Amino acid sequence: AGAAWACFRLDGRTLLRVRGPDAAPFLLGLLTNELPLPSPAAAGAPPAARAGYAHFLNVQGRTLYDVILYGLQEHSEVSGFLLECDSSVQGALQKHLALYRIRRKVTVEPHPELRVWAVLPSSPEACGAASLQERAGAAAILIRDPRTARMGWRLLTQDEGPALVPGGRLGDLWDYHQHRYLQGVPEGVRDLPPGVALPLESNLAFMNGVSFTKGCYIGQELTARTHHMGVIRKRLFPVRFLDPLPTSGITPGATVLTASGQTVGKFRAGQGNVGLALLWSEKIKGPLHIRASEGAQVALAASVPDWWP
């Protein structure tokens, strides 16, 4: 097992380009976070690029779309950003952006030629992880995942990932999603159903995705109220199914139960024997299970990610 990095082509994610003199205030009014912006050119022109995490919320304060924002270098009157969204919502996100671009000097275009890749360390110790990007060069747009270091690097490229990453092999996309679920990282519309998922229950603050010191944005009121009312009472947690599973798997929405039969949450989504569940943030320790169709149990275990604060 000789490759130090696994390189995954994320066909479920895609890029939109948002550019124009008004691109920043335009996006800031629609997202939960500040936008990524690198320090200005200093004594030359090295590749200073940053990523940020945010959600687009609806007016009820529910998450619509989870996005990663990338700062484009424009060096001129026009701001520019790449927005990475779930491929299945690209069109709905475009219509959502258009609703708000009346009297805004901004254009929104798909950038289908640049593909989204993820680069995960094969071993968590990651000697040499520190030097990967300087050790990859300016050919590779390789940026630390803004949600957590546990998610490795985003690589935006037209090329093949391993051709740019020293020690990198192509990975099986199954293993990328397995890693997400083991680490408790939600991504995309199954984990975050548009208009149903709630951002702070989806651990947005733990993932560097919300600012409580920014100006107005859609959904800000509910989100701020929830944050300031006290500890969040339900969150998405990683779960592991302990016994061999049905052939269909587990139905999204299935009730998670204590040994007493008390409801403590609902299964959200997963792959294989791992997934996420929306649970009360108390009482994730007790023995938990879901009821199969006979009522026969599927056991499961919930845990607390090690990168959470």
Distance CA(219)–CA(263), nearest Å, equals 29
Nearest to 80 by CA among 156, 16, 19: 19
Distance CA(81)–CA(285), nearest Å, equals 42
Q: Decide: 142 and 136 in contact? Cβ < 8 Å.
A: yes
Q: Which backbone phi and psi does 11 adopt, to 5 degrees?
A: -65, -20
Indicate the domain borders of the chain. 1-309
Distance CA(131)–CA(5), nearest Å, equals 13
Question: Residue 158 in 3-state DSSP?
Answer: coil
How was this structure determined? It was done by: X-ray
Distance CA(34)–CA(143), nearest Å, equals 18
The secondary structure of 134-152, three-state, reads: CCCCCCCEEEECCCCHHHC
Distance CA(18)–CA(111), nearest Å, equals 10
